[PDB]
Structure 1
Amino acid sequence: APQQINDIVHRTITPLIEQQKIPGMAVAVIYQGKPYYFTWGYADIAKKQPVTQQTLFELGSVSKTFTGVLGGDAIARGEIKLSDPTTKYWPELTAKQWNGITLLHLATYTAGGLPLQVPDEVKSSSDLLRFYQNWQPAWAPGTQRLYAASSIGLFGALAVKPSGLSFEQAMQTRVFQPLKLNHTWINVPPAEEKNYAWGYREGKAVHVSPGALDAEAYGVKSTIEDMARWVQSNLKPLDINEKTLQQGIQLAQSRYWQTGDMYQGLGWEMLDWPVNPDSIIGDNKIALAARPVKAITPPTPAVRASWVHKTGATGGFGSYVAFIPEKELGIVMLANKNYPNPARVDAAWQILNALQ
């Protein structure tokens, strides 16, 4: 990589790894549209397997960006509309509180307080139906945002109904394949198990456990090369050949709601660029932050001068993606230890600010 890119990347990441005691990490910086990779440490400490450009990491919540784009692609295909009520795609959802709750609300965490997580006790599709039927909104739809995997997760499951494909089949055929993300998976196959890093939590090797709507909210595993291709795709949607996918990417970056300096997209979250690092560095220390939202009516189409980003974690991994369309600049950081979000954003900001 150009020495400048090399130098900022290393002087920022080495101290981060040391301060947070991260076992393994991979970073990609997209500069003027070209990817540069860096790797440190171990994918598997016991087996002394190093992190490489082929190592798979759990993306955790960064998976929501794929769900948002897959949903955008379904809208572009005319299979669903964000303005449709949730009950159009799940008729059995006859509980009256669902009247007025649209796919837009589900996708942007504005349905009225759906929970951060689907209860672990929900193990069957029947359990799932009961869970949503019995849920009691704390607020009217479209008035407050409460980050929720049960919200965007349900959106993903419903968005693929019209197609008749399973969520995984739809993700693979409509998003992974067209973008050539050949090393990105919802279920890691046996052929790839040797590249699947272990996550580390309190010194124990761990992999994310199965759960209701896991594919839709936190189930993707990917390599640093594929994630760099994912950022390139979202940086320049106009270069994507598949029509509906190009539109779906653009739709995921439209601004649907505003809370303070942040705007909510489908999966992606955005701030205006240039951004004050404090506005973003704007943490996982709060298990629930309910925030009033202002609807952007109609939504603002994807803005190039934005800091577009998404953080994610699983018990043993921590990831972060951020890019600036206007500068053809972006970064992906994947680690096999869940460490503080503020540290991720600060590191990413130091690197991208330096390169712009």
Structure 2
Amino acid sequence: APQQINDIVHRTITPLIEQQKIPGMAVAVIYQGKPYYFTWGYADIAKKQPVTQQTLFELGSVSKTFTGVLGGDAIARGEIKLSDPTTKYWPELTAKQWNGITLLHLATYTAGGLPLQVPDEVKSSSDLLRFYQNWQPAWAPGTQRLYANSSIGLFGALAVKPSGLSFEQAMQTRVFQPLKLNHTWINVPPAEEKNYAWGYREGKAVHVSPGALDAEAYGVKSTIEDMARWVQSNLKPLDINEKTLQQGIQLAQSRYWQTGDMYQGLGWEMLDWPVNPDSIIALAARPVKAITPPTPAVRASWVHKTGATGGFGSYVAFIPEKELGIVMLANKNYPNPARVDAAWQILNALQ
């Protein structure tokens, strides 16, 4: 690593780990389009297994970037349109509240107040149908944003329906494989368990538990190397050989809605670059303004996503205009503001 990167990263992350009591962490900085890796601490405290560049972390909601891109790829393929009604892909969804709710609304949390969490009791396909049928919107579609697993999760399941493929199969074949993300999993195979970090919550080792729409909303596990490659792909979509995937990436970074200083993409969220971290709560309802039509991906943006599971905390942010990015993977769920502060400190220094 160039000394500048080594220094800013270590001097920022070391105190972070100490203040937040993070067991293990991996960080990748993409600087002029080249990745640099850093690791600290334990993937498994009990077995004294260190974090390495091959350690798997639960990405939590950073998984939504993959879902948003897979969706974009499906649009590019002509398999779905975001202007399509949800019922086009789920005709059993007959309750009248669903009239006027489009795939766009699902993808961007603007359907009218879909719940943050799918209830635990919701297991089967029939359970899900009943859940969405019984749901009562607080608001008309496209008037407020409420971040929600049950929103983008449904979008993910529906977007792959035309493909004929299972969600995991579509993600594997259309996103992971093309991008050479060969150590990124919705389901961690036994051959890779040796690398799967434990999450820590209240000092107990924990992995994410199965749930409806988990794959779609929060279920991806990945290494720091793969996430660095994910950032590279999103920084420069044009280098991507597969046409629809290149387009899907671009679509995921389009600006569909504005709330305050932030713009909603598919999975990704964006703010105009430059900006201070200050500009960058269980339930937070905000009115949205439609961007009509959506603005194509803006190079001078801070594009980011935070993610958490019970035992993991992740963050990704990049700035296309400066070919610069960062991935922070930790096996403790620590406060978002601390993640954003650290990322900003590192990227600001290098930009």
Instruction: Quickly name the TM-score band, shorter chain normalised.
Output: over 0.9
Cα separation, 2, equivalents of 1:321 and 1:275: 16
**1:223 CA displacement:** 0.1
Deviation string 1:34-72 (CA, Å, 9 cap, x unpaired) is 000000000000000000000000000000000000000
Which residue in 2 is equivalent to 1:24? 24
Query: In structure 1, the residue corresponding to 2:13 is in which secondary structure?
Result: helix
Residues in 2 aligned to 1:346 and 1:82: alpha-carbon distance in whole angstroms: 34
Q: How does 1:246-285 map to 2 (within 5 A)?
A: 246-280=246-280
Q: What secondary structure, in the 3-state scheme, does the structure 1 residue paired with 2:65 have? A: helix
Q: 1:50-199 counterparts in 2 under 5 A?
A: 50-199=50-199
Deviations 1:248-298 (A, max 9, x none): 0000000000000000000000000001221019xxxxx001000000000
Rounded Cα–Cα distance in structure 1 between residues aligned with 2:323 and 2:203: 38
Q: Give how far 1:234 is off.
A: 0.1
Structure-2 separation of matches of 1:276 and 1:175: 32
Q: Percent identity?
A: 100
1:178-197 deviation per Cα after TM superposition (whole angstroms, max 9, x unaligned) = 00000000000000000000
Q: What displacement does 1:354 show?
A: 0.1
The CA deviation at 1:22 is 0.1
How far off is 1:157 after superposition?
A: 0.1
Measured in 2, the distance between the counterparts of 1:175 and 1:85 equals: 25
Q: 2:213, 2:4 → 1: CA distance?
A: 42
Q: Secondary structure of 1:177's match?
A: helix
> How far, CA to CA, are the matches of 1:259 and 1:203 in structure 2?
37
Q: Over aligned residue pairs, what C-alpha RMSD do you find?
A: 0.8
What do the CA deviations read for 1:9-45 (whole angstroms, capped 9, x no partner)? 0000000000000000000000000000000000000
Q: For 2:12 and 2:121, how far apart are their aligned partners in 1?
A: 42
Q: Distance in 2 between matches of 1:328 and 1:242?
A: 21
Alpha-carbon offset, residue 123 of structure 1: 1.0
Using the alignment, how far apart are the partners of 2:116 and 2:277 within structure 1?
A: 26
Q: 1:313: Cα distance to partner? A: 0.3
Q: What SS does structure 1 have at the residue aligned with 2:121?
A: coil
1:219-254, Cα deviation, whole Å (9 max, x unpaired): 000000000000000000000000000000000000
For residues 275 and 11 of structure 1, the distance between their equivalents in structure 2, rounded to whole angstroms, comes to 22
Q: Could you tell me how far apart the structure 2 residues matched to 1:154 and 1:123 are?
A: 14
Partner SS, residue 280 of structure 1: coil
In 2, Cα distance between the equivalents of 1:174 and 1:142?
Answer: 29
In structure 1, C-alpha distance between the alignment counterparts of 2:182 and 2:127, rounded to whole Å: 34
CA distance in 1, matches of 2:89, 2:193: 35
SS for the counterpart of 2:316 is strand
Query: What do residues 297-351 of structure 1 show as CA deviations (whole Å, max 9, x unaligned)?
Result: 0000000000000000000000000000000000000000000000000000000
State the distance in 1 between where 2:210 and 2:277 align. Answer: 35
1:25 aligned counterpart, secondary structure? strand
- The CA deviation string for residues 110-164 of structure 1, in whole angstroms up to 9 with x for no partner, is 0000000001110111110000000000000000000000000000000000000
Between the aligned partners of 2:181 and 2:96, the Cα distance in structure 1 is: 41
Partners of 2:106 and 2:172 in 1: CA distance: 22
Secondary structure of 2:294's counterpart equals: strand
For residue 329 of structure 2, give the secondary structure of its aligned residue in structure 1: strand
SS at match of 1:43: strand
**What are structure 2's unaligned runs of at least 5 residues?**
none
Where in structure 1 are there 5+ consecutive unaligned residues? Answer: 282-286
TM-score (norm 1): 0.98
Question: SS of the counterpart of 2:17?
Answer: helix
Matches of 1:164 and 1:277 in 2, distance apart?
42
Q: Deviations over 1:197-238 (max 9, x none)?
A: 000000000000000000000000000000000000000000
CA distance in 2, matches of 1:14, 1:204: 23
Instruction: Give the Cα–Cα distance (whole angstroms) in 1 for the partners of residues 320 and 335 of structure 2.
Output: 26
What is the rounded CA distance, in whole Å, between the counterparts of 1:86 and 1:186 in structure 2?
25
- Normalised to the residue count of structure 2, the TM-score between the two structures is 1.00
Q: Partners in 1 of 2:108 and 2:253 — Cα distance?
A: 12
Moved more, 271-280 or 146-155: 271-280
Alignment length, in residue pairs? 351
